[PDB]
């Protein structure tokens, strides 16, 4: 198990423009295109991201390429983020994945807002952090995914992703 398989399970794979859980135009493996309600704006963003006239549809190779770029960016983002880097650096390799997962889904800014949870993770107070992370819009809106990520932070193992 690794970050790519983890996110592939949480985000799925779709080759045509779709709306994510919040209603935003997305494609591939959770690649957000735009928050604008315009499917045209979305189609424009897609072509620009892929470098060709896609008309709203891409190939698996293209999907995997975007996914790779996105994970890469997420990690680099964490590493240059003042509030996130120290936490990331304090964690083991499995837990690094749970943090990347959150950033991939909500963005740096979103994650940087979990101040108290972050301090608890830094202090390695696993159960306390898990309870705190659950007190959030994130948990209430996407509970199954949040439960998987939280369990990952709590246990430091891939159990929540086993049998999926």
Any residues with CB less than 8 A from the CB of 141 and at least 6 apart, and which?
21, 22
Q: What angle do CA 5, 71, 52 make, to 5 degrees?
A: 105
In eight-state DSSP terms, residue 31 is E
Question: CB 21 → Cl ion: shortest distance, Å?
Answer: 8
Does residue 136 touch Cl ion according to CB under 5 A? no
40, 7, 6: which is closest to 17 by C-alpha?
A: 40
Tell me if 117 is assigned to a ligand binding site: yes
Q: Choose one: 28-36, 95-103, 117-125, 134-142; the region binding Cl ion (CB under 5 A).
A: 134-142
- Strands 31-34, 14-19: pairing is unpaired
Find the binder of Cl ion among 90, 142, 151, 155 (CB under 5 A).
142
Question: CB 93 → Cl ion: shortest distance, Å?
Answer: 24
Find the binder of Cl ion among 51, 53, 144, 163 (CB under 5 A).
144
Does residue 148 touch Cl ion according to CB under 5 A? no
Find the binder of Cl ion among 145, 149, 154, 160 (CB under 5 A).
145
Task: For Cl ion, give the closer residue by CB, 87 or 103.
Answer: 103
Task: For Cl ion, give the closer residue by CB, 43 or 145.
Answer: 145
Catalytic residues: 11, 20
Q: Which two tokens stand for residue 28?
A: 């591939």
| Torsions phi, psi for 18 (to 5 deg) | -140, 175
Other beta carbons within 10 angstroms of residue 60's beta carbon come to 10
| Interface with Cl ion (CB under 5 A) | 142, 144-145
Binding residues for substrate: 32, 104, 117, 132
């Amino acid at each position: 198990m690794n970050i790519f398989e983890m996110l592939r399970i949480d985000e799925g794979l779709r080759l045509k423009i779709y709306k994510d859980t919040e209603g935003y135009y997305t494609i591939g493996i959770g690649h957000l295109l735009t928050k604008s309600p315009s499917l045209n704006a979305a189609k424009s963003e897609l072509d620009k991201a892929i470098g060709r006239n896609c008309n709203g549809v891409i190939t698996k190779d293209e999907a995997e390429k975007l996914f790779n770029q996105d994970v890469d960016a997420a990690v680099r983002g964490i590493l240059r983020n003042a509030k996130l880097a120290p936490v990331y650096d304090s964690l083991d390799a499995v837990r690094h994945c749970a943090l990347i997962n959150m950033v991939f889904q909500m963005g740096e800014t979103g994650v940087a807002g979990f101040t108290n949870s972050l301090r608890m993770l830094q202090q390695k107070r696993w159960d306390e952090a898990a309870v705190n992370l659950a007190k959030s819009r994130w948990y209430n809106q996407t509970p199954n995914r949040a439960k998987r990520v939280i369990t990952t932070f709590r246990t430091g193992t891939w159990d929540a992703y086993k049998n999926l």
